[PDB]
Amino acid sequence: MKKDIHPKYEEITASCSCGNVMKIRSTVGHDLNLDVCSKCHPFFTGKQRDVATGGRVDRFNKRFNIPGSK
Amino acid sequence: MQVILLDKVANLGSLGDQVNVKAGYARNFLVPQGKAVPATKKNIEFFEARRAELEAKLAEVLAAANARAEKINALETVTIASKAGDEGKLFGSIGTRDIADAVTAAGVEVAKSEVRLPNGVLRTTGEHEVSFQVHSEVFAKVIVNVVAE
RNA sequence: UGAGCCUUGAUGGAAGUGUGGACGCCAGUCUGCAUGGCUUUAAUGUUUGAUGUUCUAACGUUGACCCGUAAUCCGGGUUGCGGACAGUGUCUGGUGGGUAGUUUGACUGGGGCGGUCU
RNA sequence: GUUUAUUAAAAACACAGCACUGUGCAAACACGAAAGUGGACGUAUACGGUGUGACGCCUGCCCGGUGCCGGAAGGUUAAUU
RNA sequence: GGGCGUUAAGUUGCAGGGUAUAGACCCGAAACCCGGUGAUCUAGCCAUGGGCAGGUUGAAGGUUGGGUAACACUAACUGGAGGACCGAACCGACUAAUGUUGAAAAAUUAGCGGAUGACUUGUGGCUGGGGGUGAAAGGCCAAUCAAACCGGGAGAUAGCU
RNA sequence: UAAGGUGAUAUGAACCGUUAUAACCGGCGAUUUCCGAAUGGGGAAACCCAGUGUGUUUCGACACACUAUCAUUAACUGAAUCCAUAGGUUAAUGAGGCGAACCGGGGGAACUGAAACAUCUAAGUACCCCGAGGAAAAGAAAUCAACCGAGAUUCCCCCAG
Ligand SMILES: [Mg+2]
Ligand SMILES: [Mg+2]
Ligand SMILES: [Mg+2]
Ligand SMILES: [Mg+2]
Ligand SMILES: [Mg+2]
Ligand SMILES: [Mg+2]
Ligand SMILES: [Mg+2]
Ligand SMILES: [Mg+2]
Ligand SMILES: [Mg+2]
Ligand SMILES: [Mg+2]
Ligand SMILES: [Mg+2]
Numbered sequence: 001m002k003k004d005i006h007p008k009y010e011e012i013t014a015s016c017s018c019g020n021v022m023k024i025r026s027t028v029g030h031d032l033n034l035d036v037c038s039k040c041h042p043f044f045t046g047k048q049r050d051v052a053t054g055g056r057v058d059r060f061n062k063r064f065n066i067p068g069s070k
Numbered sequence: 071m072q073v074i075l076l077d078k079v080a081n082l083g084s085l086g087d088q089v090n091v092k093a094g095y096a097r098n099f100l101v102p103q104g105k106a107v108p109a110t111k112k113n114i115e116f117f118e119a120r121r122a123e124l125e126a127k128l129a130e131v132l133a134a135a136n137a138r139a140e141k142i143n144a145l146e147t148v149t150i151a152s153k154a155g156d157e158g159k160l161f162g163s164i165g166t167r168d169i170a171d172a173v174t175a176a177g178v179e180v181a182k183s184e185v186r187l188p189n190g191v192l193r194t195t196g197e198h199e200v201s202f203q204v205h206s207e208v209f210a211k212v213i214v215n216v217v218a219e
Numbered sequence: 220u221g222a223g224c225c226u227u228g229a230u231g232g233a234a235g236u237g238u239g240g241a242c243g244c245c246a247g248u249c250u251g252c253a254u255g256g257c258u259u260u261a262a263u264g265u266u267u268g269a270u271g272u273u274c275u276a277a278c279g280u281u282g283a284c285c286c287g288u289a290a291u292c293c294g295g296g297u298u299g300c301g302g303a304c305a306g307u308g309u310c311u312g313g314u315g316g317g318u319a320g321u322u323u324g325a326c327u328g329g330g331g332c333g334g335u336c337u
Numbered sequence: 338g339u340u341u342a343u344u345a346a347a348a349a350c351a352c353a354g355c356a357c358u359g360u361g362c363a364a365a366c367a368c369g370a371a372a373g374u375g376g377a378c379g380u381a382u383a384c385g386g387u388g389u390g391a392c393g394c395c396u397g398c399c400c401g402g403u404g405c406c407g408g409a410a411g412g413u414u415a416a417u418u
Numbered sequence: 419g420g421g422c423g424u425u426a427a428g429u430u431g432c433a434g435g436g437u438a439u440a441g442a443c444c445c446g447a448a449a450c451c452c453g454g455u456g457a458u459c460u461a462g463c464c465a466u467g468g469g470c471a472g473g474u475u476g477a478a479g480g481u482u483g484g485g486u487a488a489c490a491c492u493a494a495c496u497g498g499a500g501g502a503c504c505g506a507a508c509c510g511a512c513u514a515a516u517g518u519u520g521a522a523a524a525a526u527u528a529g530c531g532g533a534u535g536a537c538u539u540g541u542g543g544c545u546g547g548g549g550g551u552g553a554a555a556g557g558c559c560a561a562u563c564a565a566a567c568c569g570g571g572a573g574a575u576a577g578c579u
Numbered sequence: 580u581a582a583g584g585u586g587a588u589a590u591g592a593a594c595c596g597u598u599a600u601a602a603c604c605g606g607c608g609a610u611u612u613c614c615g616a617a618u619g620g621g622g623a624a625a626c627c628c629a630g631u632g633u634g635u636u637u638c639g640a641c642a643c644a645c646u647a648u649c650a651u652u653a654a655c656u657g658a659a660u661c662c663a664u665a666g667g668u669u670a671a672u673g674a675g676g677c678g679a680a681c682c683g684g685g686g687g688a689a690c691u692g693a694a695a696c697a698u699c700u701a702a703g704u705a706c707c708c709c710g711a712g713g714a715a716a717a718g719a720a721a722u723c724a725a726c727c728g729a730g731a732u733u734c735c736c737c738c739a740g
Contacts, residue, residue: 012686018320020698032307034278036102040664043294049308080275095303099276 003029003048005055005063035060073100073107074117086117132207139210142202148172151217152193160193160216169200172214 002008008029015025032052033044037060045067047055055063071093074086083091088109096107107113150172152162162168166182169191173180186203191214198214 021319036098053308095277098278
């Protein structure tokens with residue numbers, strides 16, 4: 001639902017089988033929290049994968065300079 | 071896999087490693103409160119000035135901190151009874167305070183962060199040995215004793 | 220304890236007496252040490268895979284207490300217990316009907332049952 | 338004893354008894370987005386779930402089939418490299 | 419040699435015959451799907467209040483007198499049980515007649531069962547449709563229930579009348 | 580603008596007007612109870628209750644006026660913890676709700692057809708949700724071409740069923 005840093009997902013899709021299922025699929029990603037900011041100290045964001053790995057090449061700061069600004 | 075300790079701590083590096091280091095280990099412990107590291111362009115070049123500019127410390131500073139084992143050795147017996155009782159045991163707590171605080175029983179003061187004793191001290195009353203460890207370059211010697219009341 | 224590079228060895232300071240490991244078509248040679256005047260393969264460096272040792276430093280805490288707060292959430296702080304474990308991400312061997320992908324003919328004295336389709 | 342009020346009162350449901358299994362208490366489990374509540378103001382001689390079958394006398398033989406419980410040495414076997 | 423061609427005038431309108439894509443002559447299902455409205459009936463349950471002349475019988479236990487070495491045993495009095503009795507209110511519906519274009523879309527009349535209990539009732543609250551509730555009949559969920567009502571997909575489809 | 584005129588179902592009464600502030604029409608205003616985004620709090624809509632200020636005051640009062648919530652900024656206050664934040668107060672701006680269709684976007688059927696039915700169709704239609712405008716939306720090559728070259732996006736007819 002979140003993965004804040006990055007968008008998210010929760011888009012639907014149909015999970016076909018052998019030929020076809022007109023069913024539906026959805027909810028993905030995950031969560032976690034408690035991220036230590038070099039500054040004061042951690043607010044627990046509920047990012048997920050692709051969000052967690054993002055806080056790496058990036059920052060922790062710029063990775064937050066948005067969930068604030070905007 | 072890229073950091074700069076400088077304040078070596080059992081890690082395969084001193085004065086900060088410039089080649090492949092550990093990863094995910096510093097994200098929560100090393101970097102926080104411990105020894106910050108980021109071996110990324112910016113922080114890198116800034117360390118060169120701390121080294122390319124390089125000592126009077128080994129001759130002078132070492133001396134303003136080496137007299138430790140010499141200033142405190144002939145000391146009068148430490149008489150801080152740790153509530154010896156319980157049919158042959160004690161009541162008083164022996165850990166960090168009574169070891170170092172045993173010096174201001176007349177005035178002088180120290181820092182509880184210099185003690186040298188791996189194991190905690192058994193709550194006895196005998197010749198409590200205290201190997202004062204001010205700095206790596208220089209070590210000292212102290213004692214402690216318990217009485218009945 | 221395996222294996223890769225490959226580093227130092229055995230095939231392809233001047234005599235004699237000796238000690239050890241080597242293997243045999245076997246009657247033998249190999250090979251360090253005192254006194255005497257490239258590959259087949261072994262050790263050390265290593266790189267890396269295995270078990271097993273120990274360490275703290277991962278972060279965990281659905282323990283306690285303090286504020287926000289006349290909240291059971293959450294966050295911060297103190298404290299305790301756990302601790303580089305757990306757990307997560309990528310990769311990888313298992314296992315995996317738990318799930319999925321792979322319609323059910325016609326003829327016929329209605330149809331179906333039966334029978335037949337060359 | 339109970340049941341198809343209004344075509345079935347039974348050999349069906351229940352029953353006491355038996356067994357398996359789960360639950361260390363903020364119990365398992367259930368109602369509930371949560372708070373909270375039931376279980377229980379009980380705490381393994383207790384509570385739940387499954388199957389077998391008031392009180393009395395009892396409840397025989399079969400584990401081949403299916404299911405479940407234990408083992409897991411060996412065979413077969415997924416992703417993965 | 420044989421197949422197909424080779425001194426067949428076509429083309430563009432207009433009106434018509436046919437064909438193609440379209441509804442598709444008209445009316446009609448039982449149904450499926452989507453979104454809302456419904457627990458003012460009824461089924462359960464929650465909270466808070468009320469009712470039971472109505473009347474009867476009268477077990478176990480006990481108090482006391484008697485009595486026993488002690489009990490049993492007994493006599494009264496108290497006591498108050500029971501798929502107990504008849505029994506009004508109240509609750510329910512076993513039987514027959516009448517009604518059947520009714521007084522009434524389930525009742526009236528005479529009987530009938532329970533009536534201190536798994537009782538009965540007022541007020542308000544909570545469960546929503548493949549869902550609820552159910553001492554279980556597929557019963558009840560507003561005269562509707564083997565899947566409610568309302569609106570929509572919708573002119574569903576109808577080789578049938 | 581003007582001789583009439585006081586809206587309609589019915590006059591009638593009592594009247595206003597004929598010159599140029601009587602009507603009547605058009606513009607800008609003034610007023611504009613209660614409810615309704617409803618905004619001081621509550622509420623079964625048009626009702627109920629308060630705080631803090633006010634004027635006239637025969638100086639209790641009447642009514643009036645302000646006081647919702649969010650967001651931006653401003654200043655002031657300000658925890659666990661020195662700091663700093665969290666939080667709090669005040670104030671100025673602004674939003675909030677209606678709205679027919681067209682438009683961008685998030686979510687998205689089934690009947691139906693395939694003479695059955697799963698791929699496929701219906702159709703990204705129905706519908707539901709958000710948003711904005713007068714239109715919206717789109718709009719200067721890491722485009723295409725084929726060794727020739729074209730030259731941003733958009734909309735129209737062809738290429739082609
Ligand atoms: Mg459906
Ligand atoms: Mg009563
Ligand atoms: Mg009843
Ligand atoms: Mg009579
Ligand atoms: Mg029953
Ligand atoms: Mg029942
Ligand atoms: Mg029925
Ligand atoms: Mg007002
Ligand atoms: Mg409000
Ligand atoms: Mg066809
Ligand atoms: Mg269609």
